[PDB]
């Protein structure tokens, strides 16, 4: 289904990376944030929603998602929040993203740059179509 | 032409908004940064390139685009360095929602959302976010 995303967090070098996965395509977007707060999480989701037509987000039900800033953001953007609901068979994608980050880490002075290089690699990898090609094909309305 | 973008700066409240416009669609992305630095520019371009198939970026030629860190980012991502209304439109939306946010950055991203999702014309029309996705999907196929 084209409008369904899953958000996950992963912690590295003592920083936090918020990852949004477009479930149908495996396409990802990611940002390093200083901590898993309501306001940081809200701002991430507002940006994501401005970029793609986001109808539903599955979350881990962390306290950052139960916050009223996140709820305000989701209602403003018309996003339905599904807290603590798995769509079924991820920690692979976290271990994978961290695998790729580990491979490019020596090419960037700062972790945030390495994370973006890793996102680029991930979304462009042919598996035949890339995740980046699949998300657009799935979302296109004509 | 599917891989061409234009990047422009706007100054508001002593902050800088970097605005990337996908030329063929009018779709935008934007970020708010403290100052127009080579580091921030490179970071914005790698984020853009991991999301969309960016081949060419047209810019204002300022010193942020000349830096060795921007050249290293562009080399890595395969980007060649070699719409003014869209920016005035963005600025006007930002003004209209500005008071609904404590921070400039939240108003900027609301305006981005409003801009990319707004249908142009009547029944039969498209939003910029629909146009970009349709342009790229058609190009792949």
């Amino acid at each position: 289904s084209p409008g369904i995303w899953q958000l996950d967090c992963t912690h590295l070098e003592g920083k936090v990376i918020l990852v949004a996965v477009h479930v149908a395509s495996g396409y990802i977007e990611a940002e390093v944030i200083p901590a898993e707060t309501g306001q940081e999480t809200a701002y991430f989701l507002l940006k994501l929603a401005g970029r793609w037509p986001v109808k539903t987000v599955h979350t881990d039900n962390g306290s950052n998602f139960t916050s009223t800033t996140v709820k305000a953001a989701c209602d403003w953007a018309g996003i339905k929040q599904e807290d603590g609901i798995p769509y079924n068979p991820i920690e692979s994608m976290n271990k994978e993203l961290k695998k790729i980050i580990g491979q490019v880490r020596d090419q960037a002075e700062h972790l945030k740059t390495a994370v973006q290089m890793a996102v680029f690699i991930h979304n462009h990898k042919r598996k035949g179509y890339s995740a980046g090609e699949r998300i657009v094909d799935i979302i296109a309305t004509d | 032409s599917p891989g061409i973008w234009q990047l422009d700066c706007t100054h508001l409240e002593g902050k800088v908004i970097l605005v990337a416009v996908h030329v063929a669609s009018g779709y935008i992305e934007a970020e708010v940064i403290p100052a127009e630095t080579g580091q921030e520019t490179a970071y914005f371009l790698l984020k853009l390139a991991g999301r969309w198939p960016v081949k060419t970026v047209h810019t204002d030629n300022g010193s942020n685009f000349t830096s060795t860190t921007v050249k290293a980012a562009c080399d890595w991502a395969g980007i060649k360095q070699e719409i003014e209304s869209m920016n005035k439109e963005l600025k006007k939306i930002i003004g209209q929602v500005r008071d609904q946010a404590e921070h400039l950055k939240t108003a900027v991203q609301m305006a981005v959302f409003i801009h990319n999702h707004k249908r142009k014309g009547g029944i039969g029309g498209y939003s910029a976010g629909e146009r970009i996705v349709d342009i790229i999907a058609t190009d792949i196929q």
Partner: peptide, 6 residues
């Protein structure tokens, strides 16, 4: 206000 406000 959408963010920290309000």
């Amino acid at each position: 206000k959408l963010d920290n406000x309000x």
